[PDB]
Paper text:
Among the 8 core effectors, AnkH is the only one that is conserved among all bacterial pathogens harboring the Dot/Icm T4SS, including Coxiella burnetii and Rickettsiella grylli. While many L. pneumophila effectors are dispensable for intracellular growth of the pathogen in macrophages, we have previously shown that the AnkH ARD-containing effector is one of very few effectors required for intracellular replication in macrophages and amoebae and for intrapulmonary proliferation in the A/J mouse model. We determined that the host nuclear protein La-related protein 7 (LARP7), which is a component of the 7SK small nuclear ribonucleoprotein (snRNP) complex, interacts with AnkH in the host cell nucleus. We conclude that the AnkH-LARP7 interaction impedes interaction of LARP7 with 7SK snRNP, which would block transcriptional elongation by Pol II, leading to host global transcriptional reprogramming and permissiveness to L. pneumophila.
The crystal structure of AnkH shows that it contains four N-terminal ankyrin repeats, followed by a cysteine protease-like domain and an α-helical C-terminal domain. The ARD is followed by a 4-turn-long helix α9 and an extended β-hairpin (β1 to β2, residues 123 to 162) leading to the middle domain. This domain (residues 163 to 361) contains a central 5-stranded antiparallel β-sheet, β3 to β7, and is extended by the presence of helix α12. The C-terminal domain (residues 362 to 461) contains a five-helix bundle and packs tightly together with α9 and the following β-hairpin, forming one domain. The N-terminal and C-terminal domains pack end to end into a crescent shape. The middle domain forms an independent insertion attached to the side of the ARD that typically functions as the protein binding surface. The structure-based sequence identity between the aligned regions of CPLD and XopD is only ∼12%; nevertheless, three β-strands and two α-helices are structurally similar between AnkH and XopD, with His243, Asp258, and Cys324 of AnkH superposed on the catalytic triad of XopD. The orientation of these three side chains in AnkH deviates from the active configuration, and a small rearrangement of the triad side chains has to occur to attain the active state.
Numbering used by the authors: 0 to 342, 348 to 464
The structure:
Amino acid sequence: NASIANDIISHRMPDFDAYLRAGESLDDIDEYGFTPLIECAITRQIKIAEQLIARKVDINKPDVTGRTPLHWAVDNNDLDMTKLLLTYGADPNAYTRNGLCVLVYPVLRGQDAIKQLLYHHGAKLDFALDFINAKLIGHRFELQGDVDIVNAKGEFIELDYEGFILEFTVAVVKDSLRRFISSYSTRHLRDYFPYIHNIMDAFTDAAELLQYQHHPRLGEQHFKRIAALLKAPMLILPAASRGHALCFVRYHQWWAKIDRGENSLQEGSVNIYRITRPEALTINFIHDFLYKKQNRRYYHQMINQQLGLLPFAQMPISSQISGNCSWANVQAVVPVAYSMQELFKPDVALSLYDEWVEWDKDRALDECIQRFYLASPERKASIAAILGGILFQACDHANKRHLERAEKILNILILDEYYYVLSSYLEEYCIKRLTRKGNNLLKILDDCGINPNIGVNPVA
């Protein structure tokens, strides 16, 4: 074709004057959904970006998802492009449509240089930390609905507990594993740490392979990278099908499909096959798998025939029929990849999975509790809302661990300045009508030595 986007992708300096005479604006959204500056950021082309900035393009204009050019430069860990953008007015606290600010991914990936560069130009870390913690809590505790967090301007923005973000999920799962094997309370699991390490490695590669999905036109270097990763011992392939993320794991001659949703009613959650035609696992296979649009028939039948997937084993992973199973599908990668490395004993893998999940629940809760006492009034209100959501939705009065979490939470929700949270709940689920969860909340309050003085009593 003939396009400024195709010029940028092909590393050719565009003839900006010819495109302007043709009636185009250098801020226009191109055929790939991006602006010329966002194309420069994606392709790490700093000279073309300098040219565009010289022609006074909107340096903060995002794509439909809300990713500003600074978002794209930072997600690439490109220090020069990030510095160029920040020099000419890129908002360091811009957030995407889901509320994901510029700092989130560098925080999750431990990229200290770009984090300090963003700090120097005004980025606020609390926004990223609160977003990460709220999303992790909504996923781990299976919370429903929304909650309001505080942006870098002290204003409340909505956050969807149920919204699934794939790259965010991969990053947060890798970081959670890193924190898990580094906790004192998990030293008795030291012998299991090497295998986990490998899993983390795979997750890293997965992140890379996912980022290339945003590129408008993959080239020689992307295919060289895919060829390099096809030689890695372990491979994690998340696939999008029917609005859900299902997961595949390759480890040497073994292949594994993880789908805890509707399909698990027919197949079970986790199936492990032997790859009898490894010669079909090529660059073109990975491209069809990750970078072309495929239907359910491709992921549930075509790949079995192409790779010659011989059924070998299965894992009794619990189904997730209600809601969105993408998060659970990504979580289940850890025990499945562990078991595949063991090659067969799902016992240790499932026990490790349960221990990791419960530890991460308690870690996120402790993060919230610790940040409450150091927080501003608005962030305190947000954290109190999150804790009340945890208490009301995820704590059963017959579970002693849930009761310990409820004690932790009620230490904060009983303060006079925040009791209103509990008040609201008891107003909307105990006085107006006695729901099941309102009854459970009354029971929990009584088992912690708390009389709400509301006129309603539990019904055992």
